[PDB]
Structure formats: structure tokens, C-alpha cells
Design an enzyme around this catalytic site. Structure first.
Site, PDB file in Angstrom:
ATOM      1  N   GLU A 139       0.811  -1.205   0.000  1.00  5.81           N
ATOM      2  CA  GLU A 139       0.000   0.000   0.000  1.00  5.81           C
ATOM      3  C   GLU A 139       0.846   1.257   0.000  1.00  5.81           C
ATOM      4  N   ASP A 156      -9.205   2.669  -0.341  1.00  2.00           N
ATOM      5  CA  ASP A 156      -7.903   3.251  -0.067  1.00  2.00           C
ATOM      6  C   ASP A 156      -7.771   4.528  -0.876  1.00  2.00           C
ATOM      7  OD1 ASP A 156      -7.475   0.975   1.357  1.00  2.00           O
ATOM      8  OD2 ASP A 156      -6.493  -0.117  -0.177  1.00  2.00           O
ATOM      9  N   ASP A 164      -8.494  -0.089  -4.457  1.00  9.07           N
ATOM     10  CA  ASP A 164      -8.205  -0.667  -3.171  1.00  9.07           C
ATOM     11  C   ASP A 164      -7.152  -1.711  -3.446  1.00  9.07           C
ATOM     12  OD1 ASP A 164      -9.808  -0.344  -0.405  1.00  9.07           O
ATOM     13  OD2 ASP A 164      -9.223  -2.365  -0.448  1.00  9.07           O
ATOM     14  N   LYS A 185      -5.030  -5.069  -2.357  1.00  8.04           N
ATOM     15  CA  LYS A 185      -5.323  -6.346  -1.747  1.00  8.04           C
ATOM     16  C   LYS A 185      -4.035  -7.132  -1.931  1.00  8.04           C
ATOM     17  CE  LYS A 185      -9.639  -5.420  -1.248  1.00  8.04           C
ATOM     18  NZ  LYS A 185     -10.101  -5.073   0.075  1.00  8.04           N
TER      19      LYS A 185
END
Ligand code: CA
Ligand code: CA
Lengths: 237, 229
Positions: B40, B69, B85, B87
Site C-alpha cells: 500500500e 484506499d 483498493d 489487496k
DNA sequence: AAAGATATCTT
DNA sequence: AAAGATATCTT
């Protein structure tokens, strides 16, 4: 003691260093986000070499979980005494402004404390102490090595304490669906000092071993430490 | 486009530790908890760079249990927002793709903007293959990495969604259980995004409940024939 | 599997 | 508060 040495080393390191990013082997630095999932990971990583150093100094072996979803973050033991193990677990919470009341989630109440080998690196009974290193932080482009002091850090202040789990454990759950023990909701001083609610570690264990997962189930039994002590008075009926 | 530029930037763009402002480096742990945080953090600059290039503002969540996110949008088109997002999973694959009882069932629940404002929901999924308690100095080449290799893909959330839940007590959508290639290519099981969403909006939480309704895509399709009863 | 651990947050 | 989201893994 291992315990004063560890405390001292953590307090010290926390004052002498601020983590500001993750670095690639090619030298690019990425800044940190200010979410507790980032900061708990960072704080866990920052602590591992200190625990390890202080542990070696006292002849303890340090083992980390081999499998995921296992407690504790660190098991320390002397090879001579394998059945007097110490469990250290890192916990983190944030504050919006220094000195507010804080609380921690202190681990599940339906796994190893109810079933001696459920989700734990060694059987529960082999541990003689469960310590919590708690971190409290005030929440607040790539860069090059030449810029380390320029990267904005994502927290204003960080405080750390080491205390026994039973000592800072509260009597309300810290989470619903994932059934965690909630800590006292208190000021940082209270965690350092150990101003909790349980009288012994046996009382803490009996309370969370018999705590019911929902309030409709708890309404009949106990919802806090005073109803638990009444329940106990009357014969657990 | 924003999407081809982002995919190119992700493939184009190896982390080995956290560094303090004083220059001591602490190595990386082995859990996926550590690596999901790292991937991330790794992606934020990339996403922001590309976004800027196409005139999109990027927004992260203020509250810590909100999706997505990254929300991307032109200030001229505010109900054409994009959700990205991140993952992560490992190989020594399937992903968990978010709750099925929050914003997909309740338009403002646990989401930064109302669900209706988003026109796409992209997943950047990282897959790493699993393989120190000393600190290092700005010795970078001597630091052990906790992973052996990492692959990344960008794909639409509906195309890679499966029909079995990815978690139980935290009610997550499970992805297809497939090879990396199938995710890249988008070899999913739903016919449309409309079908993906209706399956997950009506999926029951336990097997008990599910056994009288549907447990997989064939059974949902038969439940539709029956008149959603 | 499906169910429930790991950790912490939000209302 | 209690309950349920955030992410992902294990059995
Ligand atoms: Ca832990
Ligand atoms: Ca997310």
C-alpha cells in the site's frame, strides 16, 4: 531484571529515533501513512531488534510465530527453563491530542485463554508472564537518502510502556465480532503505573473465561467487574 | 488512459526495510500484515503521480475502517469517481475483496463517498512468494527481503469476484481461486457487474440460511428462475 | 468449506 | 456500550 532493561531500552530507542519511511535496496524511500495498521506494523518492526538485544544479554531465546494468527509476537525463554516462558505482545492505539484517555484491544478471549493450545505458539500453561508493550502515537512522493530529514513523519508524539496484560485488562470487550479483551480506558500514566481493575491474574482469567460473547447472554450473568464479584459471591449462579 | 497508464506505472515500478530519520534501517517481517502495509505504501506515490497527470484529485479515508484506499475524481465530474483498493496474498491464489454487508448493501456505510458516486472499483492485487533482528546502516544490499518475488495486477472488482465468502465473521467477498494469469485476463464467473452485485447483496451470512437460498453461482441462477424465493 | 482467529477502529 | 466494519489467514 529483563523487565527493567527492556523498559529502559525501549524508552531510550523511542526517544532517539523516528521512523520516517520504508526504503528500497535501490535507495528510494516511500513515506508512511498515518493509519494504525501502518503504525502498528512499523512499531512492531522497530521493537524486534531491541527485544532481541536485551533478551540475548540475559541468555533468553527469542522465538516469533512461525504461522500467522498466533500469539505472542515474541516468546522468550531460557533453554534451561523451557516451561517458564515470557510472552511479549505489541499493541498500538492512537490519540488525537496528547493526554487524552486511550484503550487497547488485548487479544481474543475465546482462543488460548480458554483452550490451552488454540492460536498460540506454545501451550498457554508454559507461560508465566504475558507482557504488553503498548505504543500510543498522536496522529498527524518518493524521496532519496539525501532527504531523510525532509520527509514528513505521520505522528506527533509516541509513548511506550511495558505492563502485564492482566494488570491493564478491563472488564468490557474491546471488539464485538472478533471477541477481544478491552483494556482499561485510562490515561497513559495509569498503564505505566498499573492502575487496573483486577485484583489478581486469576481473577482476570476467571472473568474473561466466563464472559459471554453478547449482551443478551451477559444480561443474565455479568457485564462488568462488580456484577462478576456479586456472581462469585452467590456461588456462580 | 488513466487505467493503462496506472497499470504501466505499476508493472514498471524492492523494499527491504523501514528507515529512521537518523538513517538506521530495520528489516521487514514475514507476516502478510507487514507486507500488505508495505505494498500500500509502495503504491501511493505511483497512484498519485498518474492521477495528477490525468487531472484527477486523489483522496484517502480519514476514518480508519472506510473503503476505498484511494478515491480518484475530476472536480468537473464528481459522480464519476473511481475506487482503487489494494489487496495482498501470498504463494509459497485468492483474495478477500471487502465486506458484503457494508456499502454494497448500504450506500453510505463505511465508504468515503456514497457508493452511487463511484463508476468503477479497481483492485490492485499483489501476490508475493514467501521465502533478521539486527539493524542496518545505509548495508542495503546485505538485508534479507522477506519475499522471493512479487506480481501485481489491476482489474475491476466485479470481474475477479467469486461466489464463496472470503471470510466468516468479517463477511468478506472471496475472489475467484485462480492462477495469476486469470486475474490479469479477467476470467471471472459473473456475467455482469449487475449480477455480481445482486449475488452479494442477497448472499446469506451462514450456511444454515444459505442452504435454503443459494451457496454458489449455479444455485443463485436457479433462485432467480424461482422468482427470488 | 465454512467458521472463527490475528489487530484496531467507529459510532 | 455493544456491535460490526477494515484486511487476510488458518483449519
Ligand atoms: Ca501480537
Ligand atoms: Ca482497503
Amino acid at each position: 531484571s529483563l523487565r527493567s532493561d527492556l523498559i529502559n531500552a525501549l524508552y531510550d530507542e523511542n526517544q532517539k529515533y523516528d521512523v520516517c519511511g520504508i526504503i528500497s535496496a535501490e535507495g528510494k524511500i516511500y513515506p508512511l501513512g498515518s493509519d494504525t495498521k501502518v503504525l502498528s506494523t512499523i512499531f512492531e518492526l522497530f521493537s524486534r531488534p531491541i527485544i532481541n538485544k536485551i533478551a540475548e544479554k540475559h541468555g533468553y531465546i527469542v522465538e516469533e510465530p512461525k504461522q500467522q494468527n498466533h500469539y505472542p509476537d515474541f516468546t522468550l525463554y531460557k533453554p534451561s527453563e523451557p516451561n517458564k516462558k515470557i510472552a511479549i505482545d505489541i499493541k498500538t492505539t492512537y490519540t488525537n491530542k496528547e493526554n487524552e484517555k486511550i484503550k487497547f484491544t488485548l487479544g481474543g478471549y475465546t482462543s488460548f485463554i480458554r483452550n490451552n493450545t488454540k492460536n498460540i505458539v506454545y501451550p498457554f500453561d508454559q507461560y508465566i508472564a504475558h507482557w504488553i508493550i503498548g505504543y500510543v502515537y498522536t496522529r498527524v512522493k518518493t524521496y532519496n537518502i539525501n532527504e531523510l530529514n525532509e520527509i514528513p513523519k505521520p505522528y506527533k508524539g509516541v509513548k511506550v510502556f511495558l505492563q502485564d496484560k492482566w494488570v491493564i485488562a478491563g472488564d468490557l470487550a474491546g471488539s464485538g465480532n472478533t471477541t477481544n479483551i478491552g483494556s482499561i480506558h485510562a490515561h497513559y500514566k495509569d498503564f505505566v503505573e498499573g492502575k487496573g481493575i483486577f485484583d489478581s491474574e486469576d481473577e482476570f482469567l476467571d472473568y474473561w473465561r466466563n464472559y459471554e460473547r453478547t449482551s443478551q447472554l451477559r444480561n443474565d450473568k455479568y457485564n462488568n467487574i462488580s456484577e462478576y464479584r456479586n456472581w462469585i459471591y452467590r456461588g456462580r449462579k
